[PDB]
Target: Spike glycoprotein
Amino acid sequence: QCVNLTTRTQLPPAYTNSFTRGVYYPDKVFRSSVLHSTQDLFLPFFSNVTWFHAKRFDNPVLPFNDGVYFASTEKSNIIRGWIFGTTLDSKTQSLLIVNNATNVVIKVCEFQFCNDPFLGVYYMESEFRVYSSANNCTFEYVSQPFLKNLREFVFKNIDGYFKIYSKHTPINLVRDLPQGFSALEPLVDLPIGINITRFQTLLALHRWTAGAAAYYVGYLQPRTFLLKYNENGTITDAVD
Model:
């Protein structure tokens, strides 16, 4: 494997604005209609969130500062997972997430991630061009797959736990993030306990066309929000 495609493309990043997005439930306790102020990692409102597009490749190693907010429209299922890790090489085991068509597999091993990892599709035949070798590891998780049907993901690595929050929303807006407030709900809390400082997304490439999609990467920062809870427990509004 390990085919290289990034010849010279070094276009400057395009910044959209994360108007009011990426606000999850930062607890496992149900709350009625009450004003509760939480002090946790959150994506600041109206922050400059980078805009990457499926076309022009755009699979850079993105720093995992304190947690990232991953939003992708991808009206066709082209996004396949993420390869969070510190070095993405030997001597440092890294976290890998992929869902094929009906099941998600999460592996944390000493992978040999290629310089341009991706997943091939043939008519849907899945081929792995992510890693060349994968051995000497302990963690293995499988469940229902995580995935214009906008979907947002927030990953955070705290106290040795890898926490994933997701919320799938159908949108009709043309290109950018929607206007409505949406509350993300956690999927899993994997006790991975590794050091994570960078990550990279995985696409589905045809035989090398890059389809037509885009993903949004914003970084969490420590902030104190005021979550407005509804009667059913849904966070209908929040302020910085």
Q: What stands out?
A: DSSP finds no helices and 21 strands in the chain. The radius of gyration is 18 Å. The chain has one domain: 14-239.
